[PDB]
């Protein structure tokens, strides 16, 4: 009777949405002070609810056993423990607890011990959330749409799995490269409901903010983000692809001509093979990766010698059949790459961890210790010829990427610099070859392409040829600038490649290059790869074409090698006698686009070079001059020298520290809490907001456009709690068969600060946008059938704007329940 509630007022409990949890404390009518006198209880005398209440006899017995063992009491009560025997034991436990409280006059040990005991109960930990599925964080929980117990978080939407393939709910029949629905809605952390028109409008607001970051933050139009990279296209409602499209038109006029489109060249991270034709049918407002060419490169050059495939795919298995690409404008624009901050980097780290560290590693949720231990092996393997974990023939992949036509190459930072360590600190063994190839791409690479696969000796070789500036076909003759341009690349993927004397590899170079002298650019040696940085530096190894413009090679030149850079043969030749400042690139015409497509893969777009300027595993910064953006501002001249046109920067948002995923362990910037906190409140991994502005300004100085990561899928770890009606679900959002979480209350962390940059800039510019661009809000979106709803600005992120959250390890009955009436405790 003494241990009841002081007053049934909300201030007497530790509530969440006026509900009670297992770890909740309360203020009783009387405190058993020191365990002797029943004293009236002040406001600072909160006590754990579990000290005097239990949601079943079993849990009470477990409480008795655990606290007896923890406090020093001998006797523990077994299976058949009578009802009242447990009550008297709990009274003894309370007496001992208050006695030990007065002996220390704090209540920290009690908090810790109660938390531990709660975490030892079945329905208060992961056990009630199991079975785990293929979610990157073990499981998912979908917030119910009509939660009677919590209208706090309802929604008329939460439309799931609306990928570009599955935008309308049924799989699109127009695209059949992918059997599946082309993605899944639940990827990581708290999943943003991008099917809510309010959230769509807020995403448009965030996009406008990012595109005008300079003006909005430092009153400087020189420091605006030029382009965007839409992250996790396959995990969000694809209506955003229209919204981001529309805007890029209405706000920047990319549809009008080609110069605007190229000045705001936006890309997608869409993995499903259906996404590139879906985007081409959308109107080519953005460009998608060439996944086919990526896989061809990976499986023909990078894989170990056992698992390496033939070389023919490198020609045919792509978006452009580069057998004879004699076209002024390619059918579909694309950007190609071999590695990225995630693709074929964190995968290799996972492989190493699962092999020689922690075989039980779950998804990509690494620990920093595991990361460093694995990186030791990674850095050693990168330097060996016999590679167990890392890529072979990286230089060959980049030699093909930077000479290919009809695609925009994206050079990854971690292929020129160490994936770990400080930014642009230590170079890789391939740095020289890649830099030489970029400079030679500026100087020589232009015109039509021709690729040939020749079976010679015991193996095969491939020859990629660029005819030169102006020469679109082999028959075209061009002019003097044409003759000093063009390039030949000869690659083999077998170290055992040995030709006989009777074997000759013929390489047609184009009608422009008849009887011309050619000098080696890159050459494979036993050392590694010799780069020739000028005609002089290689004048000892000149060779000539015949009267039909054919380079001819034999066993003297082509043989199999096996060194830490080449598992095969690499030979790149350029014509002799080009000006040291010769440039074969083109700028985009101002002529009005006519075909209804915004971005065109013309000769001007082929001249662009994307650069992914960050690694996931960048070492943290000690001093100012080690910040990433500072070093970028310092070394902008290097990027200008390399021919970089679009610099894809890391996501500059400030990182959370929960550690539930790799993104929040190395703090790349994809795990964030405030979407507008671009290094404002705190510095990000790469520098303060002012450092970012300086970097953007320095990049714009040399004419380089800047690309910002647009990440509308998920947000990590909000500070405020919230109780929601929810159901256990897989990554596809299907309810788990007979889980204990079925329309059940759950304590998610889905309430934003409310005094962050999200409160400041949230929906600020909406009023402006429908002023200047009304048609953006006229469009009836595809998945929803209704236009964006900018009426309400999103100042505080609530669970109503979210599809759900990864399982949190809190339990299915973590929200307390009166076992008599079988309803949750309310207030
Ligand atoms: C997490 C990261 O990748 C996610 O997508 C993965 C897919 O689930 C995989 O299936 C894989 O697709 C391959 C399949 O064979 C098939 O889909 C094919 O068509 O394409 C692939 C061929 O090899 O692709 C991914 C491999 O991990 C997710 O969809 C993607 O958006 C994610 N990328 C970034 C996202 C976030 C969000 O926080 C950031 O952490 C990083 O920027 C990246 O991780
Ligand atoms: Ca999603």
Numbering used by the authors: 221 to 1047
Quote the passages of the study that discuss this structure, keeping the authors' original sentences:
More importantly, we have now co-crystallized the GtfB with acarbose, which highlights differences in the interactions with ligands in these distinct Gtfs. With this work, apo structures and inhibitor-complex structures with acarbose are now available for the catalytic domains of GtfC and GtfB. The four rings of acarbose occupy subsites −1, +1, +2 and +3. However, using a hydrogen-bond distance cutoff of 3.2 Å, 12 hydrogen bonds were observed in GtfB-CD, while eight hydrogen bonds were observed in GtfC-CD. A surface diagram colored by electrostatic potential shows that the active-site pocket is small and negatively charged. An acceptor molecule or part of a growing glucan chain has to bind farther out in subsites +2 and +3, as indicated by acarbose binding, or beyond. In conclusion, our work demonstrates that GtfB-CD is quite similar to GtfC-CD, although their adherence to acarbose differs significantly.
Streptococcus mutans, a known etiological agent in the pathogenesis of dental caries, expresses three genetically distinct types of glucosyltransferases (Gtfs; also known as glucansucrases): GtfB (GTF-I), GtfC (GTF-SI) and GtfD (GTF-S). GtfC synthesizes both soluble and insoluble glucans (α-1,3 and α-1,6 glycosidic linkages), while GtfB and GtfD only synthesize insoluble glucans (mostly α-1,3 linkages) and soluble glucans (mostly α-1,6 linkages), respectively. All three enzymes belong to glycoside hydrolase family 70 (GH70), which cleaves the glycosidic bond between the glucose and fructose moieties in sucrose during catalysis. While fructose is released, the enzymatically produced glucose molecules are sequentially fused into a growing glucan chain and, depending on whether a 1,3- or 1,6-linkage is formed, the resultant product is either an insoluble or a soluble glucan, respectively.
